Amino acid sequence: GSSGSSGPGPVENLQAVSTSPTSILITWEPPAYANGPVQGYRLFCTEVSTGKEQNIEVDGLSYKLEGLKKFTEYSLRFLAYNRYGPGVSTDDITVVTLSDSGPSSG
């Protein structure tokens, strides 16, 4: 069929951190040692708690995730994919969402 793909390299300046109870600011960049261009970037959000992974298709070099669990160890996975396909994937990004709790006076 279509035997012509090697897979691009792992993006650079990749980092994900939550700034709120349920969020995830993923900031990545275009790789240098990559095979050809980069059609885009694919993200995979997995809920260690349950174990469900949801594939997402974002664009650019910055995406703020929302609709997560207050405080739950989440594991994401970022990688680059071009005409050929998805290349080397990064290490499971573990980022425990913040915790909305402090001033509790009853």
UniProtKB/Swiss-Prot annotation:
Cited function: Receptor for netrin required for axon guidance. Mediates axon attraction of neuronal growth cones in the developing nervous system upon ligand binding. Its association with UNC5 proteins may trigger signaling for axon repulsion. It also acts as a dependence receptor required for apoptosis induction when not associated with netrin ligand. Implicated as a tumor suppressor gene.
Post-translational modification note: Ubiquitinated; mediated by SIAH1 or SIAH2 and leading to its subsequent proteasomal degradation.
Lineage: Eukaryota, Metazoa, Chordata, Craniata, Vertebrata
Tissue/organ expression: Found in axons of the central and peripheral nervous system and in differentiated cell types of the intestine. Not expressed in colorectal tumor cells that lost their capacity to differentiate into mucus producing cells.
Protein name: Netrin receptor DCC
Domain of life from the UniProt record: Eukaryota
Shown chain mapped onto the complete sequence: 528 to 620 of 1447
Note: Inactivation of DCC due to allelic deletion and/or point mutations is related to lymphatic and hematogenous metastatic tumor dissemination.
Subcellular location: Membrane
Family: Belongs to the immunoglobulin superfamily. DCC family.
Native source organism of the sequence: Homo sapiens (Human)
Disease: Mirror movements 1: A disorder characterized by contralateral involuntary movements that mirror voluntary ones. While mirror movements are occasionally found in young children, persistence beyond the age of 10 is abnormal. Mirror movements occur more commonly in the upper extremities. Some MRMV1 patients have agenesis of the corpus callosum.
Residue span, Fibronectin type-III domain: 10-100
Subunit structure: Interacts with the cytoplasmic part of UNC5A, UNC5B, UNC5C and probably UNC5D. Interacts with DSCAM. Interacts with PTK2/FAK1 and MAPK1. Interacts with NTN1. Interacts with MYO10. Interacts with CBLN4; this interaction can be competed by NTN1. Interacts with SIAH1 and SIAH2.
